[PDB]
Design an enzyme around this catalytic site. Sequence first.
Site, PDB file in Angstrom:
ATOM      1  N   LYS A 114       0.816  -1.215   0.000  1.00  0.00           N
ATOM      2  CA  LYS A 114       0.000   0.000   0.000  1.00  0.00           C
ATOM      3  C   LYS A 114       0.835   1.244   0.000  1.00  0.00           C
ATOM      4  CE  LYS A 114      -3.184  -1.243  -0.568  1.00  0.00           C
ATOM      5  NZ  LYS A 114      -3.534  -1.926  -1.871  1.00  0.00           N
ATOM      6  N   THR A 150       3.198   0.346  -5.021  1.00  0.00           N
ATOM      7  CA  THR A 150       3.594  -0.719  -5.946  1.00  0.00           C
ATOM      8  C   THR A 150       2.995  -0.536  -7.334  1.00  0.00           C
ATOM      9  OG1 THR A 150       3.277  -2.275  -4.018  1.00  0.00           O
ATOM     10  CG2 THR A 150       4.099  -3.176  -6.104  1.00  0.00           C
ATOM     11  N   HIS A 152       7.816  -7.597  -1.952  1.00  0.00           N
ATOM     12  CA  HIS A 152       7.447  -6.932  -0.705  1.00  0.00           C
ATOM     13  C   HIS A 152       8.361  -7.411   0.446  1.00  0.00           C
ATOM     14  CE1 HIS A 152       3.921  -4.941  -2.284  1.00  0.00           C
ATOM     15  NE2 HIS A 152       3.397  -6.086  -2.689  1.00  0.00           N
ATOM     16  N   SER A 176      -4.841   3.265   4.035  1.00  0.00           N
ATOM     17  CA  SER A 176      -4.888   2.488   2.800  1.00  0.00           C
ATOM     18  C   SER A 176      -4.918   0.998   3.036  1.00  0.00           C
ATOM     19  CB  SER A 176      -3.678   2.803   1.939  1.00  0.00           C
ATOM     20  OG  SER A 176      -3.703   2.089   0.708  1.00  0.00           O
ATOM     21  N   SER A 214      -0.905   9.205 -13.715  1.00  0.00           N
ATOM     22  CA  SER A 214      -1.661   9.983 -12.753  1.00  0.00           C
ATOM     23  C   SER A 214      -2.775   9.124 -12.220  1.00  0.00           C
ATOM     24  CB  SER A 214      -2.236  11.217 -13.415  1.00  0.00           C
ATOM     25  OG  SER A 214      -3.133  10.859 -14.465  1.00  0.00           O
ATOM     26  N   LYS A 230      -8.245   6.821  -3.062  1.00  0.00           N
ATOM     27  CA  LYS A 230      -8.126   8.295  -3.117  1.00  0.00           C
ATOM     28  C   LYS A 230      -6.780   8.731  -3.708  1.00  0.00           C
TER      29      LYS A 230
HETATM   30  N1  LIG Z   1      -1.346   6.384  -9.967  1.00  0.00           N
HETATM   31  C1  LIG Z   1      -1.427   6.571  -8.616  1.00  0.00           C
HETATM   32  N2  LIG Z   1      -1.152   7.755  -7.989  1.00  0.00           N
HETATM   33  C2  LIG Z   1      -1.250   7.896  -6.656  1.00  0.00           C
HETATM   34  N3  LIG Z   1      -1.611   6.866  -5.854  1.00  0.00           N
HETATM   35  C3  LIG Z   1      -1.900   5.648  -6.373  1.00  0.00           C
HETATM   36  C4  LIG Z   1      -1.815   5.444  -7.800  1.00  0.00           C
HETATM   37  N4  LIG Z   1      -2.145   4.167  -8.067  1.00  0.00           N
HETATM   38  C5  LIG Z   1      -2.423   3.592  -6.868  1.00  0.00           C
HETATM   39  N5  LIG Z   1      -2.272   4.490  -5.871  1.00  0.00           N
HETATM   40  C6  LIG Z   1      -2.485   4.231  -4.455  1.00  0.00           C
HETATM   41  O1  LIG Z   1      -1.522   3.348  -3.907  1.00  0.00           O
HETATM   42  C7  LIG Z   1      -2.169   2.534  -2.942  1.00  0.00           C
HETATM   43  C8  LIG Z   1      -1.928   1.126  -3.372  1.00  0.00           C
HETATM   44  O2  LIG Z   1      -0.533   0.831  -3.157  1.00  0.00           O
HETATM   45  P1  LIG Z   1       0.026  -0.599  -3.675  1.00  0.00           P
HETATM   46  O3  LIG Z   1      -0.083  -0.557  -5.194  1.00  0.00           O
HETATM   47  O4  LIG Z   1       1.473  -0.698  -3.206  1.00  0.00           O
HETATM   48  O5  LIG Z   1      -0.974  -1.497  -2.974  1.00  0.00           O
HETATM   49  C9  LIG Z   1      -3.622   2.970  -2.888  1.00  0.00           C
HETATM   50  O6  LIG Z   1      -3.721   3.982  -1.887  1.00  0.00           O
HETATM   51  P2  LIG Z   1      -5.024   4.651  -1.242  1.00  0.00           P
HETATM   52  O7  LIG Z   1      -5.843   3.485  -0.777  1.00  0.00           O
HETATM   53  O8  LIG Z   1      -4.476   5.393  -0.081  1.00  0.00           O
HETATM   54  O9  LIG Z   1      -5.645   5.526  -2.295  1.00  0.00           O
HETATM   55  C10 LIG Z   1      -3.811   3.535  -4.261  1.00  0.00           C
HETATM   56  O10 LIG Z   1      -4.887   4.463  -4.384  1.00  0.00           O
END
Ligand SMILES: Nc1ncnc2c1ncn2[C@@H]1O[C@H](COP(=O)(O)O)[C@@H](OP(=O)(O)O)[C@H]1O
Length: 222
Positions: free
Chosen positions: A15, A18, A36, A66, A156, A186
């Site tokens: 979170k 990735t 991870h 998250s 984005s 978010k």
């Molecule tokens: N292009 C992007 N820009 C910013 N945040 C992103 C993104 N794509 C995914 N995320 C956020 O990264 C988190 C997921 O992380 P991972 O891919 O390591 O699981 C989620 O957080 P939130 O739940 O806080 O929005 C997700 O919304």
Amino acid sequence: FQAKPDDLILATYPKSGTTWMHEILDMILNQLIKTHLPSHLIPPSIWKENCKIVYVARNPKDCLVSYYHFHRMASFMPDPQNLEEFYEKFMSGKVVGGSWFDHVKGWWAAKDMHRILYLFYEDIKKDPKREIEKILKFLEKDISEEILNKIIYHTSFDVMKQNPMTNYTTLPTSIMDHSISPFMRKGMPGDWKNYFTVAQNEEFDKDYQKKMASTLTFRTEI
Ligand SMILES: Nc1ncnc2c1ncn2[C@@H]1O[C@H](COP(=O)(O)O)[C@@H](OP(=O)(O)O)[C@H]1O
């Protein structure tokens, strides 16, 4: 695990960016391995070969929040019950993936000996051009302004959220139900402020200070 000198490794605690960073690295490269694992469990092959590694860390309040909502929406993940109960287990490191604290610190220290670019979720939000420019210098790759702006646009949050290949909506409702909480939720630093009570936050800052003493610093807003 025999590693190849050219392999590029993406390493995060869950979170923390990735999906986001996998997409950045994907496009720039046009072998990308993600993990991870905490630094102390990386296979020794990966160090001896001197593989380039991109690590992404995220401020632990947003990461916690998250990770909570994600627990709510993922079938294969434990019941988080309450943000309050979840907080206790997150801070203890009694969650899938273990301790955030050990994760981010271990990788922070590992960069003194090893080819690691250590980036911050929040720096990427604030200035993706600046962060992506470091990546380019790191990979010794060179790219046109035109393509660089294309990457910023493509990676984005708004764009990735509508992208089936990346938003995890191509999985059945019964493994990830997005009606509970979207996987692309978010994507905003400081979102945790909408969930931490002032008292939860004062408790956090007191545990965090103890558990970090790490020249590692974070932004909890942008
Ligand atoms: N292009 C992007 N820009 C910013 N945040 C992103 C993104 N794509 C995914 N995320 C956020 O990264 C988190 C997921 O992380 P991972 O891919 O390591 O699981 C989620 O957080 P939130 O739940 O806080 O929005 C997700 O919304």
